[PDB]
From Swiss-Prot:
Compartments, as annotated in UniProt: Cytoplasm; Nucleus
PANTHER family: FATTY ACID BINDING PROTEIN
Record key words, sorted: Acetylation, Cytoplasm, Lipid-binding, Nucleus, Phosphoprotein, Transport
SUPFAM superfamilies found in the cross-reference section: Lipocalins
Keyword set includes Phosphoprotein: yes
Function: Lipid transport protein in adipocytes. Binds both long chain fatty acids and retinoic acid. Delivers long-chain fatty acids and retinoic acid to their cognate receptors in the nucleus.
PTM-bearing positions, type Phosphoserine: S15
Species assigned in the record: Homo sapiens (Human)
Descriptive protein name: Fatty acid-binding protein, adipocyte
Amino acid sequence: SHMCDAFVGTWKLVSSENFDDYMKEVGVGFATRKVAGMAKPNMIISVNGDVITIKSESTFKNTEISFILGQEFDEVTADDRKVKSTITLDGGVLVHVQKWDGKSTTIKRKREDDKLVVECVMKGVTSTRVYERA
Ligand SMILES: O=C(O)Cc1cccc(-c2ccc(Cl)cc2Oc2ccccc2)c1
């Protein structure tokens, strides 16, 4: 159905801003922030039918989620939070909401020019992570 076509592919992190602050807001501890903040993950997005898969490979952690839009799932984040996640498409933006311990964070993923821009928001803190095709 060509849902998410423009996201599919292999992407490499090329810039980050305010990610340490976003991680602090989320509750990540010092040593994990330092190691995760160094990483330059490879994000691999694919679609098979209604199922979207987002994999991240890095020297820190490798992660993988598979999901159907609008349908809540279990996720273990790279910092080992056990969260309940729902991912939707809103106006061509992938919106990923994570709920845990009465907290919430939202991760938005959008295509902008030849980049895939990832915006991570926790309370008033935003981190912007820019990916290019690998
Ligand atoms: O995907 C994005 O770029 C933004 C992004 C989105 C959602 C979660 C995290 C994230 C939150 C905490 C920690 Cl410790 C690592 C994290 O990701 C990683 C995973 C591997 C390597 C580095 C950061 C990063």
